[PDB]
Amino acid sequence: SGVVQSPRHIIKEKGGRSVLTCIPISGHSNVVWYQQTLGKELKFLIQHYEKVERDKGFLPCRFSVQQFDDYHSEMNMSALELEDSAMYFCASSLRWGDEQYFGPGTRLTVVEDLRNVTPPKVSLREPSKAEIANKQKATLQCQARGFFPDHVELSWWVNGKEVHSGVSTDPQAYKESNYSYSLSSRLRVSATFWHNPRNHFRCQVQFHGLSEEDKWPEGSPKPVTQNISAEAWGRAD
Amino acid sequence: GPHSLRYFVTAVSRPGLGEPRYMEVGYVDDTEFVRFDSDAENPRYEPRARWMEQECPEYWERETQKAKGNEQSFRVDLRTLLGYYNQSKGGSHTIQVISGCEVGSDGRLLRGYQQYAYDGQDYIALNEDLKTWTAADMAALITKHKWEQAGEAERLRAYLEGTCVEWLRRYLKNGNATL
């Protein structure tokens, strides 16, 4: 089962065009698009029942969606503005009024200039000896900075296995400059664990950058989507 | 809130005498301008003010198609409420809804509301935050759960903020320009 949304991350130059596709649950006839901007409440865009529009809400005249004969629907975005950079969710209830099932969501970011897209730089900081000695609980600092736009997912990797315990990833990216963001995450580790030199701690930052289709002028490597990570070994004494 | 646009929806049930009398009336500010009635010979969304008579002729088909659509759903709701409350399978009943958006002088939304009532007793209503509901009895909790699962809150608040205020602008311009 499960509903499918694609693409999950796209970067579009202001005034461009793009399409968002959605595959509802097999058999579901009702589909509806929701737009969620950064922090504000869920906006109702439009809904389609059985290939026909039922109720329209906040869908601008620029966006145009339609359900196909295989019940999937695509959203056509035209003349994109900077205010349009948001998250677009696709929910598909079986019938009208029935329980709906939401989607992963598409991350759309409209940029003022495609040249300003730049991958992050990840740096990993070992804990302070004063902290491990006075507290018996160490923290590893991971600083991803200098990226644009805010399309990152930071994850920790102890001994090659992803963990979610002890992590304190920042809620949102802190934009330092107009075209440069930064993120940080700290990893609580017991001082005995950090003192074992056989343990591998790697902080990994994934960057969803330019699509392959988007052209890029030379003089610099294309900021394609990529995950770069700064690793650090455990050390004793 | 100088200007407000409301809609009164009524689905009086009479069994054995046919099908429920269903009707919608809308009042721009406090004066009725459109009305729909099931117990008309060829029912149609009709204007009730001169400036509304000067509206688009496809507008009436859009609203009439929707009006007959609500009549069907409210026919099922009248049946569903008897199942929720274990009421008599025969006997008159009345569902009424008061939908509206009252806006200030600045055009920003001051309050948006929608209130369901069964036989004069409040059933459910959308909160001031336009995200939550307040059920009134055990059965309205069943309805609240349905709208929470279906996401009806996101749809209704989008109608109250965007659709209802935008069309109040259009109605207000029509009325005051010629009246």
Binding site: - | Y7, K66, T80, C164
Partner: peptide
């Protein structure tokens, strides 16, 4: 315009 109610 008026809302399009879906059943309860």
């Amino acid at each position: 315009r008026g809302y399009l109610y879906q059943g309860l």
